[PDB]
Structure formats: structure tokens, C-alpha cells
Write a protein that binds this ligand. Structure first.
Ligand SMILES: [Eu+2]
Ligand SMILES: [Eu+2]
Length: 279
């Protein structure tokens, strides 16, 4: 399948070079997989989700996304026009308030929730969790992310936006999950992206168009935007049978575009997520 005039990040993940505008992908499109988006919520009524999104848990007064951040990330995973895995099922867990903030105890509870809730869901091709959030180092937050991965869920987390070594941020610094940095449309590391030995992979993160609340769309930047590209790619690859939740991060790294990025400090991987699609 081919999507013409696609957002640049979708085109980039299906090409060996920058500057293309068509997203090439297999028609299976992540069907049979499930992605939990652990964030500010998802506006599940947005037409771009086609009935494939639902809220399953909130830690606040309402399950509504009053911010937009979670709806944008969910759109990059699996919306029709803006998503990597256009037929996946999306589940929202609201651990962040409508200002985009949340306490570590609530974030931990949301990860433990997903590890249990997945046993109630029909996800024959596998389960992914996308965490576009983080803060200062906490061993308890890292441990919760490690538990979620060990339970059989592919965990993708943002590296952080501090232009610093990700070893001082959580859950980015947990080795056992998939820690995602950001790149721009010219194959440079995004100017805000964290780096360091704990990063596993880069994805598109500067000027990413996706869904927004009120049935709208908007372009924003961050490692929060790169993370759902990798989460959606994992769901897509699991549906094709190429990898499993336990090994998806390693498979993505082994099959990535290598050496294409500039402004990568010594000691950080030079790997950009790539779907290896061949018609
Ligand atoms: Eu190349
Ligand atoms: Eu890792």
C-alpha cells in the first residue's frame, strides 16, 4: 500500500533516504495488535480513529483529554491519515492531568494497570505500550517500566527533551525498555533530543503533524512525537510475524537505517527506525 503526500515522518520510516513524500506499508497495517497510550487521554470520538480507540482507565475526575498531547501521540501510532499502524486498536490510560503533569506514583500505577488489563483484551498479534513522558531519575519508575516489559508488553519510552544524557531521566534510563530519541526532516538529531548510551533508536520528532482535540490537527515537536512512531512500527512488525514483544526493540535496531543521522555524539547509536517494506 502507498499513502501519497504523507507527513514527512511516515515517509521517512519507509525510505532509506530523506526527502521522500510517500509512505509505503503492508496492508495488514497492525490489525490484531493493541497499543496502550499512557498519557493525557485520547479523544476517541475523533473521526481519524474510525472507532478503533477507547479510554480504559483514568486517574483523574474525567477520562477526557483536556490537553491534546495524548491525542497527538495516539494519532501518530494509529490514526488513518497520520498513523504508522493504521488498523491497530488503541487503548488510552490517563496518568497525566490536563496541564500535562502527573505524580510518579500515578504513572507507576498506570504501568502496573496495563500489565494486568492486557489479560482481559483480545490482542492476538501482541501488545505495545507508548510512554511519551518522563522526569528526573527514579529507581521506582524504572522498575515499573521493567516490570511492564517483563510481563510481555513492548515498552517504548521518550528519551527526553533536555539536550542531555538520558541516564539522568526516567523511565528513559531503564535499559530493558526501548528508549527513543528524535530526528528532523534533514536527518539531524533534533536540537532538543537527549542522547547517550541508553538510547536504542531514533525516530522522527521535529514538526510532526497529527490529531488534536476538538476534532482538529496540529504540528508539534519532541521526543514525545518520536516515541509513537516506534511504538506503531513495533505493532506493525508484530502483526507481520517478524518479531515479538520481547525482541521488537532489538529487531528494530538491527533493521534500522544505519549511519544516516548527523549531530550524534560519540557513544550514541546512529540508528533510525525503518520498516524495510518491499512491494
Ligand atoms: Eu541512507
Ligand atoms: Eu534499551
Amino acid at each position: 500500500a502507498a499513502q501519497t503526500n504523507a507527513p514527512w515522518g511516515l515517509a521517512r520510516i519507509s525510505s532509506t533516504s530523506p526527502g521522500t513524500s510517500t509512505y509505503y506499508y503492508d496492508e495488514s497495517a497492525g490489525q490484531g495488535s493493541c497499543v496502550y497510550v499512557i498519557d493525557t487521554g485520547i479523544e476517541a470520538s475523533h473521526p481519524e480513529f474510525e472507532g478503533r480507540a477507547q479510554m480504559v482507565k483514568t486517574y483523574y475526575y474525567s477520562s477526557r483529554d483536556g490537553n491534546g498531547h495524548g491525542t497527538h501521540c495516539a494519532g501518530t501510532v494509529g490514526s488513518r491519515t497520520y498513523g504508522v499502524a493504521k488498523k491497530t486498536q488503541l487503548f488510552g490510560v490517563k496518568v497525566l492531568d490536563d496541564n500535562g503533569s502527573g505524580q510518579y506514583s500515578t504513572i507507576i500505577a498506570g504501568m502496573d494497570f496495563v500489565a494486568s488489563d492486557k489479560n482481559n483484551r483480545n490482542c492476538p498479534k501482541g501488545v505495545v505500550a507508548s510512554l511519551s513522558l518522563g522526569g528526573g531519575y527514579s529507581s521506582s519508575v524504572n522498575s515499573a517500566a521493567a516490570r511492564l516489559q517483563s510481563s510481555g508488553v513492548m515498552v517504548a519510552v521518550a528519551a527526553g527533551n533536555n539536550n542531555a544524557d538520558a541516564r539522568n531521566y526516567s523511565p528513559a534510563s531503564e535499559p530493558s525498555v526501548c528508549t527513543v530519541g528524535a530526528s528532523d526532516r534533514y536527518d539531524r538529531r533534533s536540537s532538543f533530543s537527549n542522547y547517550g548510551s541508553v538510547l536504542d533508536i531514533f525516530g522522527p520528532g521535529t514538526d510532526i503533524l497529527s490529531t488534536w482535540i476538538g476534532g482538529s490537527t496540529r504540528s508539534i515537536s519532541g521526543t514525545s512525537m518520536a516515541t509513537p512512531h516506534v511504538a506503531g512500527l513495533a505493532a506493525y512488525l508484530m502483526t507481520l510475524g517478524k518479531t515479538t514483544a520481547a525482541s521488537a526493540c532489538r529487531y528494530i535496531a538491527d533493521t534500522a537505517n544505519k549511519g544516516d543521522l548527523s549531530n550524534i555524539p560519540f557513544g550514541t547509536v546512529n540508528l533510525l527506525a525503518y520498516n524495510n517494506y518491499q512491494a
